[PDB]
């Protein structure tokens, strides 16, 4: 898990989406210091094993001068970069031309644009079209359109109104993770339920991907669900990426989760009649929904400790 790394630059956003896992808004104050981010980016650019550095937020294009400065630190080291955005900047075709020219000269291999009914009150449809259309001139940048949907807001009209600008773009519609603003602003009956506590043989984490988050912590993945858990890989302020990777690979909870799946933790709670006590939901939109509910408090994580200790002595 040492070929890719992500930095969440800021919780500040121009939008205030009702589903946002971070509850991002123009008044969001959670972020790592700029100088600290410059040091992480310099270290990741100098690192011999890292191949891809991804930036996320918040809205990364909100402070474009700082994003371009971070992309320029990486440039001499020839690392690949990925970006994700709400495309607010697409309003001006000249601005789009400038940003695509910069991304192309700064080894940006992928750009994901998020647009759906939750993003629509904050960004015009025409702004997204401008970015999608200009991206045709840059075939080496992989373009994607991510649409977060609910049963009442399926984004069926958003796609029609995008017209032919979506031709050749990879579109993925996905359900909500019940975290951040989605917990309180969206009715749970509107969140699609694809999994239950009984089909445990399908609850396997897709894999680890290191994220240095805007709360100053380090997470083993970039799923919206992980940020509400107490699973952090940070032990000190100045921690190297080698140490982060060493901790990820020696974390007993994450090792058991990867090797045994969620059913190992769910069966412990069922055996000890702790499902109601831990507020484990019966149905969920995805596998990450189980993750968040198993580990979103220090009590929950610590609860598994003697069972994980028994696993370590028995195996290994």
């Amino acid at each position: 898990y040492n070929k890719t790394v992500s930095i969440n630059l800021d919780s500040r956003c121009n939008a205030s989406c009702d589903h946002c896992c971070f509850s991002s808004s123009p008044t969001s104050t959670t972020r790592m210091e700029k100088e600290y981010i410059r040091e992480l980016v310099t270290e990741f650019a100098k690192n011999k094993t890292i191949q891809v550095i991804s930036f996320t937020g918040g809205e990364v294009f909100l402070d474009y001068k700082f994003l371009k400065e971070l992309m320029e630190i990486i440039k001499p080291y020839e690392k690949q970069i990925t970006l994700i955005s709400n495309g607010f900047w697409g309003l001006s075709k000249k601005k789009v031309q400038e940003y695509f020219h910069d991304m192309n000269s700064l080894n940006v291999i992928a750009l994901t644009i998020s647009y759906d009914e939750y993003h629509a009150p904050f960004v015009k449809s025409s702004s997204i079209k401008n970015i999608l259309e200009h991206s045709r001139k840059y075939p080496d940048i992989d373009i994607s359109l991510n649409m977060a949907v609910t049963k009442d807001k399926m984004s069926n009209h958003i796609l029609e109104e995008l017209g032919d600008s979506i031709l050749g773009v990879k579109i993925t519609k996905f359900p909500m993770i019940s975290v951040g603003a989605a917990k309180t602003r969206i009715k749970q009956e509107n969140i699609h339920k694809f999994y239950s506590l009984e089909d445990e043989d399908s609850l396997h984490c897709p894999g680890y991907d290191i994220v240095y988050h805007h709360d100053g912590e380090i997470y083993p993945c970039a799923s919206p669900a992980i940020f509400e858990t107490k699973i952090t890989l940070r032990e000190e302020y100045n921690q190297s990426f080698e140490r982060t990777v060493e901790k990820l690979n020696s974390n007993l909870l994450l090792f058991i989760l990867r090797k045994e799946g969620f059913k190992w933790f769910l069966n412990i709670l069922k055996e000890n009649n702790k499902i109601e006590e831990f507020d484990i939901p019966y149905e969920f939109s995805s596998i990450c929904g189980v993750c968040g509910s198993l580990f979103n408090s220090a009590e929950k994580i610590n609860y598994f400790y003697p069972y994980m200790e028994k696993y370590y002595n028995e195996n290994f």
């Binding site: 991804s54 992928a110 750009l111 994607s144 897709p206 991907d209």
Partner: peptide
């Protein structure tokens, strides 16, 4: 994929 949900990713 879930592990790269809040990130841009190449095809």
């Amino acid at each position: 994929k879930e592990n790269r949900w809040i990130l841009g990713s190449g095809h």
